[PDB]
């Protein structure tokens, strides 16, 4: 598997796995990494929704930054200041829970520019991204004010770009040859969108969460990579949750996109490559989910899980797994009263040994 090795001391070419930080990105290539793929229950195997997109022009975007996804995003060996632009499909903790982590960790990790967040409005002020993010910064006001005494507060700003959720396939971002469009989703309440990324003849669709809708099939048409919610089966709902027959059946019709509905949508969409995500990707769930899609869609399919990567080139959309470090590292008025400062323990004795040795 992978490219043929041509020398003892050389580099293995077109490696069968993606090692993050190890591969040059071509000027007509997109890299998409799933840094989170699993619904609202927390689990080490699948963080909540998060996508990192690297474009051959040097631009990088995050779409969704769900609870737990930062551990994956930090494993990519991308400097913080290259990852400042974040698009939110909607305000479920499982789609922006780890914004606080990117904001706080990313700042310690050496980001020098503000975060730029694009997110939907809701049906009223207090149901949109602008309200949400302003209250998140106040929530973490003790973190912000204590950090800023010692680090210039510029990287701690969040420039929110709130776009109308109601808009049908309109531009929300246009810069340096890159366009994002939003259209609505049907999910929990008014606000959630899907995004389409267009650049250099490539189209990547980030479906977010939704029950099936008439917009995604129309506006996602002929995507290189189409990502859509794809729910576990009703049988699995009963087995895993103790759900009645009634509630279990209702969930795959009104609340979530069934695997079979996902099939229908990708049959309509005709993408180069479809990606099902949101479900628990386990040895006893994945197969009946896959069979559901296959009733209705026959074309190229990935069943998303954490750290799956797609390379989009003119000739191919190639699925691989990313092999990254679990033991990840970053790659490159006082708020104290005299009362607290007075409580410092003397430790000059215990430290004098290591201390003298280090200063030569």
Across 190-225, b (16+ Cβ under 10 Å) vs e yields bbbbbbbbbbeebbbbbbbbbbbbebbbebbeebbb
Q: Name the nearest CA neighbour of 228 among 203, 250, 209, 202.
A: 209
Task: Find the binder of its own copies among 175, 201, 315, 343 (CB under 8 A).
Answer: 343
Task: Find the binder of its own copies among 30, 61, 64, 74 (CB under 8 A).
Answer: 74
What is the smallest separation between the CB atom of 203 and its own copies, expressed in angstroms? 20
Q: Name the nearest CA neighbour of 314 among 29, 70, 6, 9.
A: 29
Could you tell me the sign of the dihedral formed by the alpha carbons of 329, 334, 336, 338, in that order?
Answer: positive
Give residues with Cβ within 8 angstroms of 114, minimum separation 6: 84, 154, 155, 156, 157, 158, 159
Binding part of the chain for its own copies, among 92-100, 151-159, 195-203, 223-231 by CB under 8 A, reads: 92-100
* Residue that has been written with the tokens 């797609």 in this structure: 310
What is the smallest separation between the CB atom of 247 and its own copies, expressed in angstroms? 11
Task: Find the binder of its own copies among 53, 308, 312, 317 (CB under 8 A).
Answer: 308
Task: Find the binder of its own copies among 79, 177, 222, 244 (CB under 8 A).
Answer: 79
Say which entry of its own copies, Zn ion, none residue 153 contacts (CB below 5 to 8 A, set by partner kind): none
What is the smallest separation between the CB atom of 277 and Zn ion, expressed in angstroms? 12
Question: Phi, psi (5° rounding) for residue 52?
Answer: -110, 130
The token pair that represents 60 in the structure block = 């990088």
What 8-state DSSP symbol labels residue 38?
Answer: B
* Binders in 89-108 for Zn ion, by CB under 5 A: 92
Number of residues that bind its own copies (CB under 8 A): 163
Say which entry of Zn ion, its own copies, none residue 209 contacts (CB below 5 to 8 A, set by partner kind): Zn ion
* Binders in 171-230 for its own copies, by CB under 8 A: 184, 186, 188-191, 211-217
8 A C-beta contact, residue 336 and residue 319: no
8 A C-beta contact, residue 243 and residue 264: no
Residue span 195-214 as binding mask against Zn ion, x where in contact by CB under 5 A, dash where not: --------------x-----
- Taking the C-alpha atoms of residue 318 and residue 138, their distance in angstroms, rounded to an integer, is 43
Say which entry of Zn ion, its own copies, none residue 275 contacts (CB below 5 to 8 A, set by partner kind): none
* Binders in 109-138 for its own copies, by CB under 8 A: 109, 122-123, 126-128, 131-133, 135-136, 138
8 A C-beta contact, residue 176 and residue 204: no
What is the smallest separation between the CB atom of 350 and its own copies, expressed in angstroms? 4
What is the smallest separation between the CB atom of 93 and Zn ion, expressed in angstroms? 9
- β-partners of residue 181 are 171, 196
HSE value, Cβ hemisphere, 13 Å, CA-based, for 342:
3
Nearer to its own copies, 150 or 201 (CB): 150
* Binders in 21-40 for its own copies, by CB under 8 A: 21-27, 40
**How many Å separate Cα 107 from the centre of its chain?**
19
- Taking the C-alpha atoms of residue 215 and residue 254, their distance in angstroms, rounded to an integer, is 16
- Taking the C-alpha atoms of residue 27 and residue 30, their distance in angstroms, rounded to an integer, is 9
Nearer to its own copies, 63 or 305 (CB): 305
Binding part of the chain for its own copies, among 73-81, 155-163, 173-181, 222-230 by CB under 8 A, reads: 73-81
What 8-state DSSP symbol labels residue 281?
Answer: -
* Binders in 39-58 for its own copies, by CB under 8 A: 40-47, 54, 56-58
What is the smallest separation between the CB atom of 339 and its own copies, expressed in angstroms? 6
Nearer to its own copies, 175 or 345 (CB): 345
Nearer to its own copies, 104 or 198 (CB): 104
Residues in the site for Zn ion, rule: CB under 5 A? Answer: 92, 209
């Amino acid at each position: 598997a992978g490219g043929k090795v041509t020398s003892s001391t050389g580099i293995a070419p077109k490696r069968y796995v993606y090692y993050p930080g190890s591969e040059e990105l071509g000027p007509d290539e997109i890299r998409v990494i799933a840094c989170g793929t699993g619904m609202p229950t927390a689990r080490r195997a699948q963080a909540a929704a998060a996508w990192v997109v690297e474009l051959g022009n040097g631009d990088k975007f995050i779409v969704d930054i769900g609870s737990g996804s930062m551990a994956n995003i930090q494993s990519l060996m991308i400097p913080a200041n290259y990852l400042t632009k974040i698009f939110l499909t909607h305000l479920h903790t499982d789609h922006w829970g780890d914004l606080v982590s990117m904001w706080a960790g990313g700042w310690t990790a050496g980001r020098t520019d503000p975060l730029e967040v694009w997110g939907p409005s809701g049906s009223r002020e207090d149901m949109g991204t602008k309200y949400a993010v302003e209250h998140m910064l106040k929530a973490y006001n003790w973190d912000y004010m204590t950090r800023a005494v010692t680090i210039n507060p510029r990287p701690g700003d969040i420039n929110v770009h709130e776009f109308d959720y109601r808009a049908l396939n309109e531009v929300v971002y246009q810069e340096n040859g890159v366009t994002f469009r939003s259209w609505p989703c049907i999910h929990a309440g008014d606000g959630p969108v899907s995004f389409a990324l267009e650049w250099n003849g490539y189209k990547v669709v980030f479906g977010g969460d939704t029950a099936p809708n008439i917009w995604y099939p129309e506006y996602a048409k002929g995507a290189d990579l189409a990502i859509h919610e794809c729910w576990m089966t009703s049988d699995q709902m009963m087995t895993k949750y103790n759900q009645p027959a009634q509630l279990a059946l209702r969930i795959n019709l009104d609340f979530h996109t069934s695997a079979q509905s996902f099939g229908q949508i990708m049959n309509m969409v005709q993408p180069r490559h479809a990606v099902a995500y949101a479900f628990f990707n386990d040895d006893d769930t994945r197969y009946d989910i896959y069979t559901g899609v296959r009733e209705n869609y026959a074309g190229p399919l990935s069943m998303a899980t954490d750290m799956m990567v797609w390379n989009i080139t003119r000739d191919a959309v190639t699925e691989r797994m990313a092999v990254s470090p679990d033991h990840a590292w970053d790659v490159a008025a006082s708020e104290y009263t005299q009362y607290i400062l007075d409580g410092r323990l003397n430790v000059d004795e215990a430290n004098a040994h290591w201390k003298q040795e280090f200063m030569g």
